[PDB]
C-alpha cells in the first residue's frame, strides 16, 4: 500500500520512534499532481508525535521509515489515508496521496 520513497539522504540514522515530536516541512499533492497542502506556504514547521494516531495511518507509518534531515516522497495509499471516506471538502474518496516530506528534526 504505502510506498514511501527516498528523495535525498538524511543522517541515515535517527528514524522516528514512539513519542518523538516529529518535525517536518512538507507539501501534499494528489496523484494528478494537483496540490492540496503545503507545510512551507505556512512557513511554519509541522509538528506531530508519532504513534499518537493524530494523523492519517499512512503518515503515521511511513514517516518512521525516514531519517532525520532526509527528504522523501510519501506515496501513501488511500486506505492508509482517508480512503473511501475521503477528506471532506478536500480529498476525493479513493485518492493516493503524495507528500514531499522533509524530516527537519525528531524531538
Fold and architecture overview:
The protein is mainly beta and 107 residues long. The chain has a single domain (1-107), classed as Roll (Chitinase A, domain 3), CATH 3.10.50.40. 9% of the residues lie in helices and 35% in strands. The protein contains 2 helices and 7 strands. It has helices spanning 39-42, 57-62; strands at residues 3-8, 21-25, 27-30, 35-38, 46-49, 71-75, 97-105. Strands 1, 2, 3, 4, 5, 6 and 7 form a 7-stranded antiparallel sheet that branches. The protein is globular, with a radius of gyration of 13 Å. The protein starts with a strand and ends with a strand. It is a peripheral membrane protein. The modification N6-acetyllysine is found at residue 52. The modification N6-succinyllysine is found at residue 52.
Short description:
The protein is mainly beta.
Q: CATH first level: which class?
A: Alpha Beta
Distance between the termini: 28 Å
> Which term fits the overall shape?
globular
Do you know the CATH architecture? Roll
Please tell me the total number of domains: 1
Modified residues (N6-succinyllysine): 52
Membrane topology: Peripheral membrane protein
InterPro entries: FKBP-type_PPIase, PPIase_dom_sf, PPIase_FKBP_dom
EC number: 5.2.1.8
Amino acid at each position: 500500500g504505502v510506498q514511501v520513497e527516498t528523495i535525498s539522504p538524511g543522517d541515515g540514522r535517527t528514524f522516528p520512534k514512539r513519542g518523538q515530536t516529529c518535525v517536518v516541512h512538507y507539501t501534499g499533492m494528489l496523484e494528478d499532481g494537483k496540490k492540496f497542502d503545503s507545510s512551507r506556504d505556512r512557513n511554519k514547521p509541522f509538528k506531530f508525535m508519532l504513534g499518537k494516531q493524530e494523523v492519517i495511518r499512512g503518515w503515521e507509518e511511513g514517516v518512521a521509515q525516514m531519517s532525520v534531515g532526509q527528504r522523501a516522497k510519501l506515496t501513501i495509499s488511500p486506505d492508509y489515508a482517508y480512503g473511501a471516506t475521503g477528506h471532506p471538502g478536500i480529498i476525493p474518496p479513493h485518492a493516493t496521496l503524495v507528500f514531499d516530506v522533509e524530516l527537519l528534526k525528531l524531538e
